[PDB]
C-alpha cells in the first residue's frame, strides 16, 4: 500500500491499546446504566474530549504484509491473493484446495 | 438429444389407485414445487365424480380423458422460407400428455369457488363431452382440417 497509510494504522492501534482499558469501557457502562443520573452527561463530554483516535472503530484491519485495505481475512491477517500465493508455497498448515 | 437418444422417464404410480396417469396428471398440475396440496385436490376431485357418476371413478376419468385426447397435432416449421403448420400423428405417450395439460389451464379459467371444485366440474363436463376441453378439441380439429392443406407441404 503506502508507508504513510501503514504508519497511520500503527499509530491508531497504539492509541486504542492505550485508551481502551482506562476510560472507554467504563464510560460506556456508566452511560448505559440507568442507576446513575447526569453523571452520564459529564462522562459524555470527557469522552469527546479524548484524542478521538482511540476508538477501535477508527481502526481498519489491513493486510500486514502489504497494507491492502480490501479483501482482508481475520484468521490469516492477509489480503485475499496474498493468502492464496502463500498457501501454494505451503506456508499455511493444514490448508489445501477444497473439493466437495 | 443430439447425440444419445433416451427413452421416457418412469414415474412412481398413483398410490391410492395404482395408476401412472393420475400421478402424472397431479405432477403436471403441481406448481411451484407443491405436490402435497396437489395430491389432496386430486383425491377430492375424483371422489366428487365417484358420488356423481358410477362408483368406479376410474372409468369416469378414463372417458373424460379419451374424449379430449388428441391424435393429431400442429407443428410449426420453415423449409423454403414459409411458415408451415404441418399436422402429424402423435404417439400416445404425447397424446395423453398434451390432453391433460390443456385440461389443467381449462380449469383455471373456469373460475369456480375453489380449485378442487373447478377441476371436478371440468372433469365431469368432459364426461358428457360438453366441456370446454371438447371445445378446445373441436377447435384444434377445425385448424387441423385447415392444416390438411399444409399436410402435403414440405416435410410432410
Amino acid at each position: 500500500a503506502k508507508q504513510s497509510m501503514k504508519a497511520r494504522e500503527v499509530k491508531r492501534v497504539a492509541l486504542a491499546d492505550k485508551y481502551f482499558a482506562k476510560r472507554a469501557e467504563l464510560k460506556a457502562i456508566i452511560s448505559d446504566v440507568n442507576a446513575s443520573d447526569e453523571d452520564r452527561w459529564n462522562a459524555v463530554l470527557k469522552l469527546q474530549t479524548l484524542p478521538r483516535d482511540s476508538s477501535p472503530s477508527r481502526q481498519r484491519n489491513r493486510c500486514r504484509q502489504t497494507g491492502r485495505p480490501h479483501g482482508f481475512l481475520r484468521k490469516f491477517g492477509l489480503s485475499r491473493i496474498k493468502v492464496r500465493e502463500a498457501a501454494m508455497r505451503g506456508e499455511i498448515p493444514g490448508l489445501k484446495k477444497a473439493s466437495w | 438429444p443430439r447425440r444419445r437418444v433416451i427413452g421416457q422417464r418412469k414415474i412412481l404410480p398413483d398410490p391410492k389407485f395404482g395408476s401412472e396417469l393420475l400421478a402424472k396428471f397431479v405432477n403436471i398440475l403441481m406448481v411451484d414445487g407443491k405436490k402435497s396440496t396437489a395430491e389432496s385436490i386430486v383425491y377430492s376431485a375424483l371422489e366428487t365424480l365417484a358420488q356423481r357418476s358410477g362408483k368406479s371413478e376410474l372409468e369416469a376419468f378414463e372417458v373424460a380423458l379419451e374424449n379430449v385426447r388428441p391424435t393429431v397435432e400442429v407443428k410449426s416449421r420453415r423449409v423454403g422460407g414459409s411458415t408451415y403448420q404441418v399436422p402429424v400423428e402423435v404417439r400416445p405417450v404425447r397424446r395423453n400428455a398434451l390432453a391433460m395439460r390443456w385440461i389443467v389451464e381449462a380449469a383455471r379459467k373456469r373460475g369456480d369457488k375453489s380449485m378442487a371444485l373447478r377441476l371436478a366440474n371440468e372433469l365431469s363436463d368432459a364426461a358428457e363431452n360438453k366441456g370446454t376441453a371438447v371445445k378446445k378439441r373441436e377447435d384444434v380439429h377445425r385448424m387441423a382440417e385447415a392444416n390438411k392443406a399444409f399436410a402435403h407441404y414440405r416435410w410432410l
Binding site: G71, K75, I81, V83, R84, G94, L95, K96, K97, A98 | -
Partner: protein, 99 residues
C-alpha cells in the same frame, strides 16, 4: 480421578501417530486405558478471489480440516502423569490435559 485427553491437529495421519504413541507410554508406566474416540472433524472453507484486479467467477476454495480425538484414562498414577509430561510428541498436535 479420571482424566480426559484432547488432541488437535490439522493432519489425520499425525493424530493417529500421536494417539498411538501415547498409549504404549501408558503401558510403559503400566496402567489400563480406554480407546480413543473420533469426535466430529471440523472443516473450514475459505473462498478467495484469485484475480488481482477484476473477476468474479475465478475464485478458489481452501479448506482447513482440524481433527479431534479424545482419550480417557481410568486410573492415573504419579508415574503416569510424569510420563505424559516427559514424553515428547509432534509439533503438529497440542495438549489439552484436563483433571
Amino acid at each position: 480421578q479420571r482424566i480426559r485427553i484432547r488432541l488437535k491437529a490439522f493432519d489425520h495421519r499425525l493424530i493417529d501417530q500421536a494417539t498411538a504413541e501415547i498409549v504404549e507410554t501408558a503401558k510403559r508406566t503400566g496402567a489400563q486405558v480406554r480407546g480413543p474416540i473420533p469426535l466430529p472433524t471440523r472443516k473450514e472453507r475459505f473462498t478467495v478471489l484469485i484475480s488481482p484486479h477484476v473477476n468474479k467467477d475465478a475464485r478458489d476454495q481452501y479448506e482447513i480440516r482440524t481433527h479431534l480425538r479424545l482419550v480417557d484414562i481410568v486410573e492415573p498414577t504419579e508415574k503416569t502423569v510424569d510420563a505424559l509430561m516427559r514424553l515428547d510428541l509432534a509439533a503438529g498436535v497440542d495438549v489439552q490435559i484436563s483433571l
